[PDB]
């Protein structure tokens, strides 16, 4: 299928259900449809810069919007978690981070913060000609990675060059962001990784308030060490 009802649209977009008959479908891109925020929703319904899809098209056509440091002209480009959106005319830089409720929050960041992003290592494997590379959560293939980098680790990628500046190993005591489930958007420190081979691995996370919760590993994103996040949090 190719059409999406507003009632069937993802809940986290915040979109009012009665605005119209239909909602934007995110186009193919780095992020999954159910885990992406199209630039039309971001710019019109969150930023309020545009009033309908047509001003959104005009803005994107002016090349005033950059996603991860590159200009995007697609109305339904699927911006997602840890994506940097730059508006040079307004001198504004945003990072897409889920709030406690589980919705994208339009978090303003500084230029240095915009200069880099974080990607969770989805896959580490060697391509043709024996060249190691890493595939992150946003579909970035980065060659010649540091050997210590493994799956479930997080890599700090410089947007201008697309190279790994640093990395965080996945280990107990690391600071973690929940990217799925009922605990979506919560932040906490790892306590223990409950390994079920052939099944979904579970991680226990303790918040600053000492409350503990369990979540699947696929919804886990290391963002730094306890008390020293690598990103400005909302």
């Amino acid at each position: 299928k190719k059409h999406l009802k507003r009632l069937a649209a993802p809940h986290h977009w915040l979109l009012d259900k009665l605005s119209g008959c239909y909602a934007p479908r995110p186009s193919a891109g780095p992020h999954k449809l159910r885990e992406s925020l199209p630039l039309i929703v971001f710019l019109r319904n969150r930023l309020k810069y545009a009033l309908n899809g047509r001003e959104v098209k005009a803005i994107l056509m002016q090349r005033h919007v950059k996603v991860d440091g590159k200009v995007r002209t697609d109305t339904t480009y699927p911006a997602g978690f840890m994506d940097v959106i730059t508006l040079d005319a307004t001198n504004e830089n945003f990072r897409l981070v889920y709030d406690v409720k589980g919705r994208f929050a339009v978090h303003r960041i500084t230029d240095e913060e915009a200069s880099y992003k974080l990607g969770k290592v989805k896959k580490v494997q060697l391509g043709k000609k024996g060249v190691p590379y890493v595939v992150t959560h946003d579909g970035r293939t980065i060659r010649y990675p540091d050997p210590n980098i493994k799956v479930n680790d997080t890599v700090k990628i410089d947007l201008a060059s697309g190279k790994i500046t640093d990395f965080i190993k996945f280990d107990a005591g690391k600071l973690v962001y929940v990217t799925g489930g009922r605990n979506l958007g919560r932040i906490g420190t790892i306590v223990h990784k409950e390994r079920h081979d052939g099944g979904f691995d579970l991680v226990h996370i303790k918040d600053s308030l000492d409350n503990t919760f369990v979540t699947r590993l696929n919804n886990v994103f290391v963002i730094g060490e306890q008390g020293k996040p690598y990103i400005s949090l909302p």
Partner: peptide
Amino acid sequence: HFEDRFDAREHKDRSN
């Protein structure tokens, strides 16, 4: 078996 699926009904307010 645990579904581990987010549901909209629980999150949305039922105060009315």
